[PDB]
Amino acid sequence: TPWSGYLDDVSAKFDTGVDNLQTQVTEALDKLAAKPSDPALLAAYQSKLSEYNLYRNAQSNTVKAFKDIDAAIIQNFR
Amino acid sequence: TPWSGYLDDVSAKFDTGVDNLQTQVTEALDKLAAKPSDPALLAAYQSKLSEYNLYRNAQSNTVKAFKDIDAAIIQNFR
Amino acid sequence: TPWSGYLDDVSAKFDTGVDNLQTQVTEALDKLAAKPSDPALLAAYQSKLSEYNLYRNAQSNTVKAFKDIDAAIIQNFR
Amino acid sequence: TPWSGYLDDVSAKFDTGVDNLQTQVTEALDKLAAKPSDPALLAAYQSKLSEYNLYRNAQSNTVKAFKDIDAAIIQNFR
Amino acid sequence: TPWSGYLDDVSAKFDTGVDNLQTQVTEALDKLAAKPSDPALLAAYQSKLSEYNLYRNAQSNTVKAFKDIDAAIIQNFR
Amino acid sequence: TPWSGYLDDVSAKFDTGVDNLQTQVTEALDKLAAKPSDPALLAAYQSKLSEYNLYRNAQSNTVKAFKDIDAAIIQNFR
Amino acid sequence: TPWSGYLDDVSAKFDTGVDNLQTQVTEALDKLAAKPSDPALLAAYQSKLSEYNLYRNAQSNTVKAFKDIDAAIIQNFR
Amino acid sequence: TPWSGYLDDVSAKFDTGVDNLQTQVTEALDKLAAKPSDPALLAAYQSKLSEYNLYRNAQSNTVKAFKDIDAAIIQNFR
Amino acid sequence: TPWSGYLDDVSAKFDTGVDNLQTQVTEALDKLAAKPSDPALLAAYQSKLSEYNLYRNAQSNTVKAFKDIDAAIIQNFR
Amino acid sequence: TPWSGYLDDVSAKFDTGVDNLQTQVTEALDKLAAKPSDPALLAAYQSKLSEYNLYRNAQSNTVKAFKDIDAAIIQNFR
Amino acid sequence: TPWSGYLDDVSAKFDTGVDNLQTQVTEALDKLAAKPSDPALLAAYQSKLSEYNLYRNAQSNTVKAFKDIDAAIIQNFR
Amino acid sequence: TPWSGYLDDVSAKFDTGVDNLQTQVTEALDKLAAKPSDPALLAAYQSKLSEYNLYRNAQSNTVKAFKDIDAAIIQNFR
Amino acid sequence: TPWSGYLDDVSAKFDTGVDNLQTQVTEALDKLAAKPSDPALLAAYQSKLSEYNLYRNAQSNTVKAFKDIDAAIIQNFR
Amino acid sequence: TPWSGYLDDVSAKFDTGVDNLQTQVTEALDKLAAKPSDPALLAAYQSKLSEYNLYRNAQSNTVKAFKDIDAAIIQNFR
Amino acid sequence: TPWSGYLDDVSAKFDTGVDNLQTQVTEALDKLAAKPSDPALLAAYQSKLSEYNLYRNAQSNTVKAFKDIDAAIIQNFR
Amino acid sequence: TPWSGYLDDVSAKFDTGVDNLQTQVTEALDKLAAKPSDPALLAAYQSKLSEYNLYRNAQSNTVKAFKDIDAAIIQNFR
Amino acid sequence: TPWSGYLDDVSAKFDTGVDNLQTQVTEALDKLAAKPSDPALLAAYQSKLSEYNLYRNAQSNTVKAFKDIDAAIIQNFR
Amino acid sequence: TPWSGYLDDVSAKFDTGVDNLQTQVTEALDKLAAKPSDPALLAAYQSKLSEYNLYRNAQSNTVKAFKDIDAAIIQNFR
């Protein structure tokens, strides 16, 4: 088992909270790239890519938020 | 009963002053990680994570403040 | 009763200041999704979704504004 | 009459120098929370919250400034 | 009545000179720990904790200053 | 008399500089809403709403500009 | 004649170096507030407010720079 | 039973006055070393390590204080 | 077996508490350097580099904290 | 006429060398507390409070410097 | 009239040479104990307590110096 | 062989991780500059310049991240 | 000719080592105060004020360094 | 075999108690000097140099402590 | 051959440990000054200047660390 | 010849590294101000003003970088 | 002509060896007290007060050194 | 040939043991005073001035140590 800290666990709550959004965005891009004019495939990939953009920003800004909490505690050790 | 000094009591006034903010931030992260696009869940987790950042900095800077008071008294023992 | 800090109270003044805007936007979307060509339903959902966008940005930028006030006070504890 | 030191008097010159800015910000938030789309209420609360942010930072950085003056005098007692 | 020497009387001029600063800092910490995001409670506890830090350092460096005066007189007894 | 800081005075130079533009936009909307096809009422409300959009943006970006000046001075107090 | 130290003289070289920039920004705001849609008045007030922002930051960061020079010399007195 | 003098008894009043602070600091370091990003483990170890720093300085400066009392009595034997 | 003091043992509790974080950060940098645009590789390396920054600061500020405890005991030997 | 020693005369060369800096800092705080957003009042109080911080540190470190000169002469009386 | 020897007269030249320094230090401590954060009261009490420390050491080391002169004359009586 | 430190090795993992992205962006600019209307050359240079922007920001923010780790360790040497 | 000791000669090696840096900083401030927006005048005054800050700290920490050497030799006279 | 007294034996209990700390600090400096940016080499050399500082102070203050014991016994020979 | 003490040898282990980092930073500045917009020259000079900042701080804090070891041994000579 | 320190020489490597960029930006502004609609003059002044913005930021952040190196060396003189 | 012994002549070699250092320190304090923020006046008064501290300690420890020589000769008269 | 006792020979073993450290510190100060911002000249003068501080303290505390040995032998002549 590889080691995981508290920021790894917070960043993996997002990774397991979405189920296969990393796969669904890759699968919706592959269906759309084969036919980039189907409105059903464009509106599916809009709703997947916009869901993936909010997933990756909420994941990144939460790891950065707890890292700012932790660095201000460690500053008070000395 | 485990031992607790004066800095432990000051750091636990913050811990008991918030009731379950350590739980509410963990619960708001778990609801948000399952669906990181609900504005009701993002604005809830913004108000929880920002409340937890101010909790942990006021807790840390108060234990550091009383430790600076105490170390300047102990310096005058000799 | 769950715990609520000062940022929770500011973020819930917006939540109780609007009455059921979280419901009215959900109800106007459900009426519009069943018939997305009625001008009465589109102009209702325009006025609800634009009112909800300003609600969520004023809520988020006020919790962020008071968190910036508080973090600059806590910085002066040490 | 409760006791007030010199830092309490400096921090209360700011408190009495503003008259009811602690009330005007609370009253402008309550008017804005009931209707967070009036430009007259948003521009009023912008000018109040920004005035309150500068009030609380000038109050905090002045109490910290005189505490740094005093601690360097007390250091020279021994 | 318990015995009090000259250093006890100097250290109790500070204790009675502040009235209930040992209580006001404890009461401002208890109000702040219940809600560590109110700017009125943070700026109150900043002005109390900084006033208590200067109280305890001026008390300690004055007892140490008179103890250095007294030990140099007692050295000249023999 | 209610308290007004420097940002309140700058934001009220715009409020008194326009005379009743908050009223003229409300009155031009009420005339236009009763008959939204008169070109004299549409071209009047275009010139009022565009004048009100520039009023509210110049008011908001000037209060924000002086708040950025003030926060950089207060940062140099400590 | 009121007393002026070296930081007062440095902060007043900026005050006399600009001639009436404190007046020209106040006069350009008063002309702009009466008519916040003239491009000649907006581009004048842009060039004045941006000139005043750089004036107040260069004034503040120079008084802070010499205060950091002086405090490191005074630290070496003891 | 091993021998203990008066400085050993004073240094062991601190050792028995804290109960298992030598263990609690070792246990809080072991929990923190396995995951040095949990704010609950950092704020616990801040309050333990700062409590242990004040314990070891008050223990050391009290044994040194009584040793200075005793050496000045023994000097007067001859 | 090489010699290890108490600061070496504290600094190696962090080294063995993380398992292969020195390797996982090196491996996540090598995967990211080959393709610095994969969001899965950037969000992995964010969570590793931020975990490594908190590891190295908590390790360094704990060795410095115990060195400050020890140097104040050794000062009381003479 | 109250008695004044050599340290009192050195500490009063600073008190009379500044003319009314103890008043100008109190007057600049009172003007700033009534309106803590005027850049002219903030930059005035920055230049006064920074001038007062250097005044009180140069006064304190000079009385401490001559007290260290005098105590080393008095040590050579016996 | 109580009896006073030559060491009493030397120790009372210091007592009458300072006028009410025993009172001025007691009065400056009483003003400072009521408000131990005023820089005017701390810098006054620094200059009084340091003046009193040099007064009591010069008084004690002069009585000890003349007692060493006298004891070496009396040793030559036999 | 020129000297390379640890930041040079981290900044050259990015340089060797991309193979000839510094060349491919230069070659795609040279093809595009000769004919800046081919959609095949614009979409190639979009995908190269955006890949180069993410390469140079991940390279720069990683050298800055390890420099912040190292400077906080070196601060604890003294 | 006024008297100059060894610390005066060391502090005047810095004064004559820079040629007219006390003048060049005063002249660059006077040019900048007349126009605090020229990038050529700001980057000149940055390079002068930063050169003057390093001049005054190296001058002060060298006079303090030799004074610490000398005071430890004079301590061994008795 | 060279001669060794009791202070030589106490100072060599420290020399043999550490095994090759004089070598490990020299070897950690040589690895760090070749690459003074590796966090693994900086945190190793922090833990070695801080361990060597406590070794040399405990060695020096113990030889000085026993020399003070011995010189007070030899004083009582005559 | 010029004389070199132990601090000179420690400060020259850093000087010879880096090979020509004093030259590589000077050469990377000269290439960058001729064209301060090449990302290859900026990212090279970032990695050189950050490597030189860590070199000069680790060199300075190690000479200061051994000087603190040596001065505490020399203090125990008398 | 006027005096120039090391920060002056670094800030003048940028000044001589660009040849007449301070002139070319002034000349491109003068050509553009006479006719602010020529695309050849706008695209020339874009490439000059963006080149001048990167010149002045790389010049300023390098003088600040070496000033941070120097101030940390001078701090270790005492 | 007043009488002067050998300790008076040694203590007046220091008084005439410095020329007007008793005046230059008084004159540098009077210039500094009128403006305690000029770096030229602070660095002048640092170099004067540190020169006066070494003057008064070398004067006092030399009169004490010859008094210890003389008292051991006079002890051998009987 | 001038006369030299045993303390002169011990104090000149240090003077000839360093070769021209009295010159190298004077030469490194003269190079640094001409340009007090070169990191190569500051880190050279740090390593020279710290080497000279340890030279003068080890020289002074060894002459004082042998003078304490000799004065206790001469005391036993009578």
Author numbering:
A (entry chain A), B (entry chain F), C (entry chain Q), D (entry chain E), E (entry chain K), F (entry chain R), ...: 3 to 80
Source paper text:
Salmonella enterica serovar Typhimurium (S. Typhimurium), a gram-negative bacterium responsible for innumerable cases of acute gastroenteritis worldwide, utilizes two T3SSs, encoded within its pathogenicity islands 1 (SPI-1) and 2 (SPI-2), to invade cells and establish an intracellular replicative niche. The core component of this machine is the envelope-associated needle complex, which consists of a multiring base, an inner rod, and a needle filament extension that protrudes several nanometers from the bacterial surface. The entire structure is traversed by an approximately 2-nm channel that serves as a conduit for the T3SS protein substrates as they pass through the bacterial envelope. Furthermore, four residues at the end of the C-terminal α-helix, three charged (K66, D70, and R80) and one polar uncharged (Q77), form the lumen of the channel and create an electrostatic surface potential of alternating charges, which spiral upwardly about the needle, a feature that has been proposed to be important for substrate translocation.
Since we observed no differences between the structures of in vivo and in vitro polymerized needle filaments, we solved the cryo-EM structures of PrgIS49A and PrgIV67A filaments assembled in vitro from purified mutant proteins. These mutants are located within the C-terminal α-helix and resulted in specific phenotypes, such as constitutive secretion (PrgIS49A) or deficiency in the secretion of SipB (PrgIV67A). The 3D reconstruction of needle filaments assembled with PrgIV67A fell into a single class average involving more than 99% of the particles. The 3D reconstruction after 2D classification generated a map with an overall resolution of 2.9 Å. Although the helical rise is the same, PrgIV67A filaments have a smaller twist than wild type (63.27° versus 63.35°). However, no significant difference among PrgIWT, PrgIS49A, and PrgIV67A was detected in the structures of the monomers extracted from the assembled filaments, with a Cα RMSD over 77 residues of 0.152 Å between PrgIWT and PrgIS49A and 0.225 Å between PrgIWT and PrgIV67A. However, the predicted electrostatic potential of the lumens of filaments assembled with the PrgIS49A and PrgIV67A mutants showed significant differences with wild type. To clarify this issue, we fitted PrgIV67A monomer into the map of PrgIWT filaments and found that the resulting lumen electrostatic potential was essentially the same as that of the PrgIV67A filaments. These results argue that differences in helicity itself may not account for the observed differences in the electrostatic potential of the lumen surface. Rather, it suggests that slight differences in side-chain configuration may be ultimately responsible for the observed differences in the electrostatic pattern of the lumen.
